[PDB]
Scaffold this active site. Structure first.
Site, PDB file in Angstrom:
ATOM      1  N   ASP A  35      13.816   0.072   1.541  1.00 30.14           N
ATOM      2  CA  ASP A  35      13.072   0.606   0.411  1.00 30.14           C
ATOM      3  C   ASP A  35      11.610   0.128   0.405  1.00 30.14           C
ATOM      4  OD1 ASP A  35      12.232   1.637  -1.979  1.00 30.14           O
ATOM      5  OD2 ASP A  35      13.414   0.258  -3.227  1.00 30.14           O
ATOM      6  N   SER A 199      -3.552  11.297  -0.715  1.00 26.79           N
ATOM      7  CA  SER A 199      -3.450  12.518   0.067  1.00 26.79           C
ATOM      8  C   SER A 199      -4.669  13.379  -0.238  1.00 26.79           C
ATOM      9  CB  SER A 199      -2.147  13.267  -0.254  1.00 26.79           C
ATOM     10  OG  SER A 199      -2.135  14.539   0.370  1.00 26.79           O
TER      11      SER A 199
END
Length: 330
Positions: A35, A199
């Protein structure tokens, strides 16, 4: 040193991935959920409330000759999906795919919430976010990667998740046979303890690319892709019959519909998520309504590039003094 381990979906939908991890002496092998969105390595154990264990493999520290109680230490974590666990702490030898850390904090669960009990395939978590998020008190503990880092040939690990298939976590090296083209690297902020990056935009199917900054985290521990409501609305508007269902808790679509791809930007490069990756199957057995793999992050407080996005790429988690993230197509 290096390590290399295969990670395997827990079910036919890629709801999560499990990776085998050796703990203690002699080795006890548990299947952990790697994770990159958390920083605790915790396991089902001989100390877990018996009613809360249902099929998981447990760690038994008393059977490990290298286990040492971390005296006075406790831990307690709550995740974004409302699940939780807590307990005490041992240090022990932990190996992943040939790579060994001695004196790793292994957080032994005394209590786990329902969703963990109910998932027989996940024996614990191995956190790979930054150690600043680790919940051990009074002395914060380091992640497996943080402990291994100085020993690694290169201070990196990579995630290569499969679509409906196994993939690979590598530590200490970049497998140049595992991706196509070049790796585009992008800046990381560690201020929230996550592999947080920006992004450069998105496209829906064959549509034109929209240049827009999307701050989010690279999180192998989250199944779906969570993006701003504007983005998500633009995606599902291109799916015939799709709608947002409050009773279901997100976008659903008829399984007779064709899903467009979703492209996200990494600098000037582009990662394309094929439409099939965005199908998470019937909401209930026999239903014609399918759950969508792209959902709104509104009210999470952060955007999450979960497995849906990451499994479309070869992802480098670069733990150099200034961390960065790398993405390649594959």
């Amino acid at each position: 040193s290096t390590g290399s381990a295969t990670t395997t979906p827990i079910d036919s939908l890629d709801d999560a991935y499990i990776t085998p991890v050796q703990i203690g002496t002699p080795a006890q092998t548990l299947n952990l959920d790697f994770d990159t969105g958390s920083s605790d390595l915790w396991v089902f154990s001989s100390e877990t409330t018996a009613s809360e264990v249902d099929g998981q493999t447990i760690y038994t520290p008393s059977k490990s000759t290298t286990a040492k109680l971390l005296s006075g230490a406790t831990w307690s974590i709550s995740y974004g999906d409302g699940s939780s666990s807590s307990g005490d702490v041992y240090t022990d030898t932990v190996s992943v795919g040939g790579l060994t850390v001695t004196g790793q904090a292994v957080e032994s669960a005394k209590k786990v919430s329902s969703s963990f009990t109910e998932d027989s395939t996940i024996d614990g978590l191995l956190g790979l976010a930054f150690s600043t998020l680790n919940t051990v008190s009074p002395t914060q503990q380091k992640t497996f990667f943080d402990n291994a880092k100085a020993s690694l040939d290169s201070p990196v690990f990579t995630a290569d998740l499969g679509y409906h298939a196994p993939g690979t976590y590598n530590f200490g090296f970049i497998d140049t046979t595992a991706y196509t083209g070049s790796i585009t690297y992008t800046a990381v902020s560690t201020k929230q303890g996550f592999w947080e990056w920006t992004s450069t935009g998105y496209a829906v199917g064959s549509g034109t690319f929209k240049s827009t900054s999307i701050d989010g985290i690279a999180d192998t521990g989250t199944t779906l892709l969570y993006l701003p409501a504007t983005v998500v609305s633009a995606y599902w508007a291109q799916v015939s019959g799709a709608k947002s269902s409050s009773s279901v808790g997100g976008y659903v679509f008829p399984c007779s519909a064709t899903l467009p791809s979703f492209t996200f930007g990494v600098g000037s490069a582009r990662i394309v998520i094929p439409g099939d990756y965005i199908d998470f199957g019937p909401i209930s057995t026999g239903s014609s309504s399918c759950f969508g793999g792209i959902q709104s992050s509104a009210g999470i407080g952060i955007n999450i590039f979960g497995d849906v996005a990451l499994k479309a790429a070869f992802v480098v988690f670069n733990g150099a003094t200034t961390p960065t993230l790398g993405f390649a197509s594959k």
